[PDB]
RNA sequence: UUGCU
RNA sequence: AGAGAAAUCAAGG
């Protein structure tokens, strides 16, 4: 069962598997990020030091999900 | 006659269009034709032309169409290039190509009409007949050969298609009278030695040592370097020599090594090679004849410590011990839900059982995290919690021995050390008690040799779920008062009437919820086939009691003894016995 | 127990969910299942006669008995052949529109059923590799076995698969030909179909003793699906079945209309003892034949439905790895026929590692069809009450004029079930003379209050795929419990607190972890729930995605939202998931 | 390596 | 030893 292993899996040295890339540094502030397989930190790093997309693309992804939000807050 | 769903105007329109009578099953075919024309009317309800009686021509797209009804949409093929077709199921659905030509208006109109048309065919029992008209015959799609037929008839007295020649009739059988449950049954109380405490951890007797704030290693190093351990009570089950196993793990963990090498005392503590030793001993002393295995479960009586465990588990504490992040609030319904949970946490948070649940939560989680691989060495799992001020609280340590489990239900050897307040020999016969000195403060340390499976550790790794059941009871009390008073009051604290020591006395709701959680916690940590069987068969007796309170009568079949289904589950479980005695204390007859 | 019996502001019915120890670990079965399997097999032969005579009962092919043979005072395996014809006939006139949808299902859905749905079944014992495999692999090798021996391609329709099964048994000899090139004769292939793979029923609650379940061979699993799907069509349209719907509205309507004036009402709640130890396959094989014959179905439909039950009459139940024998302190496991035991009557029926038996059933083979055999027995002129039943669990509402009339109907209900081989458990059936209290399928009823109590608590831990999927899946599970009534306003809110706090811990968002230490060191503020931020969901917002809802409330600013939603980021690239693709939808390494 | 009240 | 409950674990190589 995947639920009996998530706690152990997340706490492994390299829990996540990511496609090889160069925009993610090997080490950022003394923490080794890569080596593919990376550590659990990498998603947090991307949320602040990652590359930004266009605002139009953001609305495209959050369109069907955004509609159900205003539907709840309009009634 | 004409069906109700078929309009009268359509009925006479097609009356002379085709020789309905001079056909096979003309009546059904006529109604099918009227369906197709009605579909065209719904399509051209507001462009589309009509040739019915190509049969409809769109003017917006200049395309001719011909509506045909097909049993299966997935069996659609281009009928002809002269005229495009829209195929509709008898239930009302349309082909993916149909939705492109039409739109929401026409598609919704055609369906529903075909639904009531499908209701008409069901009502008149013509389901086969319409299909034989919508499409061709289905011929034979399955046959059984001679050889397979002979094999199928070896173990039955009938053919492949059973044709018994008896006349269908329901015989009359003489039954037995139903008897009335005039009194509630009494549950058998087993006799024998008092049941010892047989849970993974200590429960109400659990205590902790306050340590300076820091990490787990710092807390262990603080305790190990300046503590004195000496045995005051030794058990045969847990020899006093296994204290070296704990101190070795305390020293290793204090140095940053949760995993240490084997020592001599590890063989006794973790039962290394015990499988081979007992197998060799059994074979050497084996004599006689092979006999069918007969396993026996020793019956034990209700132990005195169960009642005192309930009292201690309900005792007040200083910290809240239940710190769950508050959810968001957006609506009035959301605010009431969060208020009920917030008040519930206040009622049961500052209790001993809440702190013990946290100890069980942490101990199970840490032990389970070290059972995901195969390890021939010994791992130390500290049970350390932290108060709001940050001081580390050392409940104890769990040592995990060599484990090579293949299935999740196999037992892994454990040596559990816990800090305890009061020692009771008959409550802890298999525990070895050691006196611990920590900065002029006396502490009692227990050691037990236990084996405990991976699956059971996972369930106790989220033992915090035990709070659900008492919360449901508390919520329904408050909501019931809100409904009758037409106003919600989160601070309502009504008095609950209960049978206490055989007498009916009222008791506070807040106190009733506290030791519902205490009882639920004990049932959770002592859950086993005896517990599961006892509670499952106890619900109908509990339901029977509630019927008797409101003057309802309870009746039973001929050989009905509902207490037997419960008595067989009372063997040695302490809380099951404790629950059984509570039932016997309650009145068995209601007037 | 006196603590669970309130006398003021609350009734004992409300506290029925306190009589559940589902918080603790579920029982697990250990070791061999041979004793449990043989005990299941020997019961219908013991119950076939009023006095126990296993030896004579072993020669019975069809378990049809005279009315005087039925055991009133105890379990009575076997059926009455005249009653089944009449009772099924009575079940046909009543609910005739309900069975008209069955004819539509036969004429439309049945030819269109695909055999690929057999891949979603439970663990299947391979007749090729002689070991357990999951269903999709077992189906793949079975289909290739059919294609090579029959020298033709098998159509996607389930009927084509069943036709291949009938055709392959006409062959004198059959081979697999991979390397393995293993070889079966007609009798060896026949034995594979008859074989039932028995196994322990693990993680089962509410029982002191462990039972066993049996699975059918993949060769016959195609036939089993047809009859079960046809049974599901009838049960969804007949008001006496509680299996369909899923929301358990059947008891809700009976609760509402329970109010009667100047009438002796009554509510009988109970279960069936030895439900799978007393039913005869020929009983419900005759019932299906009556249904199809009076409905006008063709002959090939009749033969298709009867085959799965005819194979079950010849079933070869696998005993397992033997009975445990002890000399001293050592244990040895031996087959049934090696040494004397309590099952010596069945030695003559031992065929290799399996055993042949013509009577009795197993729990996990025919659940829906067994329900129909119970519902047809209710259709009598004397039984004027309302009945709801799901396998070995039923509730019946009596509405009579006198108390004696109810008791006559109550006994008639008990005896009519014995005509089809179903025995009420005397110690598990409770009749409350003033109707208004009863239980059925973990639904406790008191007047207008119908309490839905979950048999198993929803898992309040993350699933283990990724933080976005886990949050959506976990909240949806809580939403289901609230919708069905298993949770209420306060319990549902507490469920998130337990789930959210456990969801944060599994992703190292609590306390001081390596993931947490990085954020407070690099000034990365927690903006998502898995990052340690405050939970943004509420009781009324269970169905809303975190990312979309945080944007509306301003929790997620524009800068961070653009980074996490990048489709070209390297991190990533109910049953389904409303989770937007983001940098937190990663995959854990294997 | 080790921090759920 | 112990865990446990109708028979297993206390590795298997």
Folded structure, characterized:
The complex is a heterotrimer of chains A (75), B (591) and C (590). Chain A has 75 residues and is mostly helical. Helices cover 41% and strands 5% of the residues of chain A. Chain A contains four helices and two strands, in the order αββααα. Chain A is flat and about 45 Å long. Chain B has 19 helices and 17 strands. Chain B has helices at residues 8-13, 26-43, 96-101, 104-123, 127-134, 146-152, 216-225, 243-254, 266-270, 274-284, 305-313, 332-349, 352-369, 454-460, 468-485, 509-525, 529-549, 562-567, 574-585; strands spanning 56-57, 64-69, 84-88, 179-180, 206-207, 209-211, 227-233, 259-260, 291-292, 378-386, 392-400, 411-420, 432-438, 441-453, 495-500, 503-508, 554-556. In chain B, strands 5, 6, 7, 8, 10, 11, 12, 13 and 14 form a nine-stranded antiparallel sheet that branches. A three-stranded mixed sheet of chain B has the order 1-2-3. In chain B, strand 13 and strand 14 (441-453) form a beta hairpin. Chain C folds into two domains: 28-246 and 276-381, no CATH class; 467-564, no CATH class. Chain C is globular, with a radius of gyration of 28 Å. Classes of the chains: A mainly alpha (75), B alpha+beta (591), C alpha+beta (590). Chains in contact: A-B, A-C, B-C. At the B-C interface, helix 5, helix 6, helix 10, strand 9 and helix 12 of B face helix 3, helix 4, helix 6, helix 10 and helix 11 of C. Strand 9 of chain B pairs antiparallel with strand 9 (323-326) of chain C, so a sheet runs across the interface. The structure holds two RNA strands. Chain B: Pfam families: Flu_PA.
Radius of gyration of chain B: 38 Å
Helix content of chain B: 25-40%
Distance between the termini of chain A: 40 Å
Structural class of chain B: alpha+beta
Give the number of domains of chain A. 1
**Tally of DSSP helical segments of chain B:** 19
What is the helix content of chain A?
40-55%
Largest sheet of chain A: 2 strands, antiparallel
Percentage beta strand of chain B:
15-25%
The greatest interface between two protein chains, and residues involved on each side, is: B-C, 161 and 156 residues
Organism (chain A): Thogoto virus (isolate SiAr 126)
Subunit structure (chain A): RNA polymerase is composed of three subunits: PA, PB1 and PB2.
Family (chain A): Belongs to the influenza viruses PB2 family.
Subcellular location (chain A): Virion; Host nucleus
